[PDB]
């Protein structure tokens, strides 16, 4: 599953182009959620920072 990294320069020239429209994701292929869930360690669950007057 390839990731891309796009830039703002190139060797071509665009003018007045179409609006490439897309829709319908589905729920089988692309699932959309949020919290988010994370992954850490074990001892890192327990820590604190003390302040002083």
């Amino acid at each position: 599953r390839i990731k891309h990294s796009l830039t703002v320069t190139g060797a071509t020239e665009h003018d007045t182009v179409a609006d490439i429209v897309l829709g319908q994701t589905g729920e089988d292929v692309i699932t959309i959620s949020m919290v988010e869930p994370m992954s850490i360690a074990v001892e890192d669950m327990y820590g604190y920072v003390l302040d002083t007057p």
């Binding site: 319908q24 994701t25 589905g26 729920e27 089988d28 292929v29």
Partner: protein, 53 residues
């Protein structure tokens, strides 16, 4: 004046597979071997056989 907010989007409409992927998610599920997708728990009530796809 709190006016809380939310996101309203059909949850059934966005379940239906694609017309060219509907092939994949039906019969060709013989390649994989289930395992985790369906839900099954057993109680010696008894008896309970809650097998739920």
């Amino acid at each position: 004046m709190w006016h809380y907010t939310s996101i309203n989007n059909d949850t059934r409409v966005a379940l239906d597979p694609k017309p060219n992927q509907i092939r994949t998610i039906t019969k060709p599920n013989t390649v994989p071997q289930l395992g985790t997708d369906y839900l099954y728990t057993f109680n010696s009530q008894r008896r309970s056989h809650t097998l739920r796809l």
